[PDB]
């Protein structure tokens with residue numbers, strides 16, 4: 190592993206060169222354990238007290254889990270107050 | 283405002299509300315007002331034809347000099363014999379069609395309501411020729427996009443038009459003279475200037 | 489001769505508890521910064537060190553002076569007093585960006601120098 | 617019909633005046649889910665309508681919209697399956713094709729006196745040529761063509777007004793505006809709203825056709841000095857006007873920040889007096905019977921934007937003797953003393 194390098198410029202070099210590679214099997218092994226960690230984490234952290242998607246801040250206002258519950262909320266609750274306003278005018282407010 | 287040379291007041295017969303005025307009339311041509319109107323329409327048509335000309339020359343010569351298409355030089359471009367048609371037919375067809383165009387433009391200039399009222403049949407299209415303005419006809423036929431629906435409050439658009447068109451006319455005079463004493467294309471003269479600018483100009487032609 | 493009546497009330501109080509007014513003299517209007525430099529009154533305060541100012545151009549808010557009853561003979565703000573000082577009590581101007589006007593001028597403008605590091609509010613009369 | 621769009625344009629004021637047209641529509645056919653495809657600050661008026669269903673935001677006067685947005689809104693109007701368009705956008709082909717791509721039974725628009733309106737008749741069942749090309753400049757009514765065709769005598773009466781501009785507020789906007797002027801020193805029955813302040817703000821709710829519609833501040837200082845204080849609350853269009861008004865007319869003068877026309881009508885409904893210039897607030901004051909005065913810059917413009925001053929018998933109109941919004945500031949104080957008590 191010892192190589193003495195002769196370069197005229199600065200100094201001599203004592204390069205080691207430990208050529209190595211994670212065994213072919215060990216790459217499958219680290220994939221195996223990481224799929225195990227993914228499995229464990231999916232199960233356990235799905236079984237966790239998820240503090241944002243439980244409260245009346247999210248599930249109360251809208252909160253179906255989509256990305257449009259805000260927009261259908263602010264597009265339907267004004268129609269809800271227009272409906273309530275018409276039903277108010279139906280009894281002469 | 284800034285009228286084409288400081289130290290000179292603009293003429294009182296033209297100022298402000300006109301497409302790119304800048305007060306350049308030292309030879310008293312727009313002194314009479316109807317003469318100025320006729321000259322405005324003349325300028326707009328001249329500038330638009332000249333803009334189409336500069337595009338059709340610069341684009342063709344970009345294709346030619348670089349070598350994308352084997353198009354002819356602007357100078358020697360009229361004598362191209364087309365297979366399907368002849369120039370002797372094309373002059374007559376141009377006469378007919380551009381007569382129907384320019385005489386309609388004229389009869390609108392002298393009578394704006396014309397070409398759209400009664401017995402002005404153009405394939406039933408007697409509505410796209412409403413005109414709306416002198417020199418700015420509008421309508422679905424002439425501005426399909428309608429970038430400037432309004433035209434009085436479109437001073438930016440008309441100013442861009444007239445400035446680009448004055449510059450295109452000057453560039454067309456450039457194409458006329460530059461390629462009658464040098465006998466090359468504009469792009470050739472440009473790259474002749476952009477190699478040694480201090481050794482290839484007009485006066486470096488001996 | 490046309491003599492504008494600057495007052496130039498100093499920022500700190502006297503230890504007795506009354507302000508000390510200096511009543512400077514200089515002729516007309518060229519720059520308020522040049523008047524306060526020439527007639528020996530304290531403009532910059534701690535910025536009176538040599539490289540602690542922009543020497544009159546306005547690129548630093550170091551010559552600021554509260555001016556009261558100064559709507560009579562004064563130039564408007566040159567978009568540098570409007571920009572260097574922004575969220576102020578609006579009676580504060582830069583001496584190297586204000587000017588009290590023309591040489592033919594009489595008036596009783598009173599200027600509180602150094603509006604930074606002061607303790608009095610002047611109880612300004614509400615305009616309009 | 618059962619489903620009807622509205623592709624109205626302009627902003628607060630033009631879309632406000634369209635409320636008798638919407639009430640006419642729901643009076644014409646019994647159950648109609650009316651929609652609105654308006655510009656921004658047009659949606660904000662449609663708390664005050666109790667009739668309609670969606671009221672989107674589109675800015676129809678954009679004339680080079682986002683093609684994703686343009687295609688999305690064409691497909692949205694196709695997926696809502698309308699029967700009648702009722703544009704009043706005042707455009708022809710290009711926009712008539714926009715109304716034509718909607719699967720609509722009754723394509724209705726307004727059409728230029730100029731040329732950009734040709735080839736539109738092909739794609740519209742009603743033409744409705746308009747005037748001035750500045751459609752808000754026509755005044756209050758603005759839709760007499762559309763009012764007279766919607767509900768022609770075919771079975772019964774047109775019924776073209778139904779006590780025009782019956783806007784209506786809800787309890788939620790009433791409570792939040794009640795808190796907003798209760799932060800000021802106003803009592804829920806006894807105050808006077810203004811909504812006229814010289815500003816550079818799009819919450820001014822003016823018009824498209826009026827230019828010098830908003831009164832100044834030192835002129836307003838003269839007006840507010842000449843008038844006795846019935847707690848005049850001041851309605852600024854933007855927060856930079858607050859310190860400016862407190863500099864001009866005083867610190868004791870109460871300032872209520874309102875940019876929403878629904879909040880503005882809620883502030884009308886608790887007031888007892890209105891000193892509005894030609895904004896939305898005159899029409900909101902005429903709604904729910906509040907005594908207005910209605911300042912203007914012209915007697916003729918005041919007749920175009922109020923043709924019904926003789927009808928309500930409270931909106932005693934005042935305008936400028938010249939143009940340019942410089943009136944007497946004296947007799948308007950006199951009939952402000954007359955009608956507000």
Ligand SMILES: CC(/C=C/C=C(C)/C=C/[C@@]12O[C@]1(C)C[C@@H](O)CC2(C)C)=C\C=C\C=C(C)\C=C\C=C(C)\C=C\[C@@]12O[C@]1(C)C[C@@H](O)CC2(C)C
Pocket residue numbers: 306307308309310311328329331332334335336337338339355356359360451452454455
């Ligand atoms: C229309 C025009 C050019 C049009 C060109 C076209 C169609 C070209 C077409 C082609 O090239 C192509 C595309 C392809 C090729 O294969 C074929 C052809 C056919 C060859 C030029 C106008 C060019 C017009 C010019 C140069 C006009 C200049 C006017 C000036 C300078 C006026 C000055 C004054 O009048 C004022 C302003 C005020 C007065 O008071 C004082 C004075 C001083 C009198």
Ligand code: FES
Pocket residue numbers: 521541542543544545546547548549550551552582583584585
């Ligand atoms: S000295 Fe720089 S601010 Fe006046």
